[PDB]
Structure formats: structure tokens, C-alpha cells
């Protein structure tokens, strides 16, 4: 199927309590494989997946140098951003950056991404053509002008279409057992009276991979989306994910309600019923 590689970077200023805290992580699809934390003792990019551990010393040395260089550049960014927005010295602010690439089934480049946020809001993003920028406010226009003058998009595009896709392909091959796998959700529904006239119906999906899934409740075939409590898909901790959806229903009406599960690992979408 389709695959993605993404790097996520977070830097947080802590004025008069040190330099900014920088955390970087990398993922293939929903599987983490590396981390760096600026506060940790090792000062190294570290493996977080068994299949990346075989990479030799040039990978670890070069990735540690590259990630430390990403950290420095966010340290500069935090100063520059406080100037652009006329913000005071004291308060903590957050810069986030994400970049990476998607490949299709043939593992050829499909789409590339490179986006920044400041204090939780879109700041500037490379557009789908990898040649132009979306800037979310006037401060981010200042960045856009500087990045256009410096031909940043061309250097990014070459990375995203080339190196990004090469390394993704490599990881998909070396970590095939983990990365090219689909685990179909184990599903069931539970039933519990909340009183003598109502019951919670909760539709469960367990032990699945990748994390993308859809769980929906119908009542006589009609979607119950406003009445459904849907929780955030969550890690089990073993490489698989879980999710549930619940509705509170009048006791006696259970057989009108059906849960519907869609997931790439299922040969067909499932309908679970109370009869």
C-alpha cells in the first residue's frame, strides 16, 4: 500500500532556565524509529525500533550531527519569532516543524511536506507543488520573502523527492516484518446498564495496525454521529492500536443499533449487531 516517513521537531523556550528544550522523533507510518532529546545525557540520535539498530556508525554519527543542527536552527527561530510578534523575553513559546514524504504502492514519490507552527498555530508550509509557500499571517510573510530570496523550496524539493523516498524505501525493506504488515482489528461490543431505562453500547476495536480506522454507530441504518462518543485512537504499547465508540441508548432498543468497523486489514467492513 501507501507509505509515509515523517520527522517531527518540537522546541520550547524556557527563559532564564536554560536553552530551549528540543525533541525530535522520526516515524515510518505509525511506527517510531528514532528520537533525540536535548536534555538527555547521551546527546545522540537513538534507535526506537529494532530494525533501525542495524544501521552502522555513519548513520548514527551523521543523524546525530543533522539533528543537533536542526536544534540550533530552532533556537535561532525562537529569538526571531519573538521579534516578529513583539513578544516579551519572559514567556515560553513553542516552535514545531514537520517534514517528510509519501510513496504509493510502487514506492515512487507521491507527495512531499514541510510545515512549521508557532505556539500551536500554522506558521508557514510548503504547498503541494513543492515550489511555493502558504504563510498564515503577516509575520510568516516575512519568512516567505526570505525563503523565496534564498531559494529554500528548491533545496527542500530535492530532499523530499530524492533522499526522503530513498531512506523510506530502505526502511520498508529492512523493517518489512513490522512495517509491511497489517493487523486487522479484533472487534466486539459491550453492554452496560446506566440505569433501569438506559444502557451504554460501546463498540471496540483492538490490536490493529496501522492506526487509521473508522468506527461508527447506526440506528436503523442511520448515522448517530452527534450522539456518539468517539475516543482518540490510542497505542496499546506493543505496536498496535485500540479505539472505541459509544452511544447511550434506551433499554429495549439495542437491536436497532449496529456498530460498523472499517480498516485496511479487514477483507470486508464489519457490521456488529445485538441480535
Amino acid at each position: 500500500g501507501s507509505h509515509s516517513m515523517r520527522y517531527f521537531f518540537t522546541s520550547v523556550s524556557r527563559p532564564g532556565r536554560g536553552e530551549p528544550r528540543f525533541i525530535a522523533v522520526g516515524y515510518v507510518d505509525d511506527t517510531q524509529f528514532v528520537r533525540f532529546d536535548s536534555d538527555a545525557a547521551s546527546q545522540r540520535m537513538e534507535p526506537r525500533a529494532p530494525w533501525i539498530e542495524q544501521e552502522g556508525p555513519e548513520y548514527w554519527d551523521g543523524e546525530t550531527r543533522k539533528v543537533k543542527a536542526h536544534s540550533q536552527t530552532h533556537r535561532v527561530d525562537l529569538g526571531t519569532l519573538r521579534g516578529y510578534y513583539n513578544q516579551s523575553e519572559a514567556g515560553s513559546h513553542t516552535v514545531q516543524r514537520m517534514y517528510g514524504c509519501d510513496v504509493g504502492s510502487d514506492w515512487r514519490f507521491l507527495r512531499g511536506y514541510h510545515q512549521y507552527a508557532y505556539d500551536g498555530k500554522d506558521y508557514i508550509a510548503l504547498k503541494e507543488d513543492l515550489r511555493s509557500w502558504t504563510a498564515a499571517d503577516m509575520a510568516a510573510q516575512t519568512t516567505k520573502h526570505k525563503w523565496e530570496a534564498a531559494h529554500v523550496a528548491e533545496q527542500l524539493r530535492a530532499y523530499l523527492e530524492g533522499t526522503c523516498v530513498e531512506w523510506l524505501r530502505r526502511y520498508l525493506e529492512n523493517g518489512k516484518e513490522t512495517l509491511q504488515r497489517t493487523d486487522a482489528p479484533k472487534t466486539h461490543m459491550t453492554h452496560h446498564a446506566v440505569s433501569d431505562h438506559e444502557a451504554t453500547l460501546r463498540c471496540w476495536a483492538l490490536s490493529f495496525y496501522p492506526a487509521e480506522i473508522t468506527l461508527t454507530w447506526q440506528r436503523d441504518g442511520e448515522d448517530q454521529t452527534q450522539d456518539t462518543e468517539l475516543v482518540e485512537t490510542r497505542p496499546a504499547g506493543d505496536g498496535t492500536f485500540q479505539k472505541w465508540a459509544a452511544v447511550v441508548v434506551p433499554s429495549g432498543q439495542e437491536q436497532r443499533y449496529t456498530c460498523h468497523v472499517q480498516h485496511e486489514g479487514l477483507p470486508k467492513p464489519l457490521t456488529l449487531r445485538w441480535e
Binding site: 520527522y7 522520526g26 544501521e55 543533522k66 535561532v76 527561530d77 526571531t80 512549521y116 508557514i124 527542500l156
Partner: peptide, 6 residues
């Protein structure tokens, strides 16, 4: 594996 200031 990884690959600019604002």
C-alpha cells in the same frame, strides 16, 4: 536520513 531559519 534527516535533511534554514525563519
Amino acid at each position: 536520513x534527516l535533511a534554514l531559519t525563519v
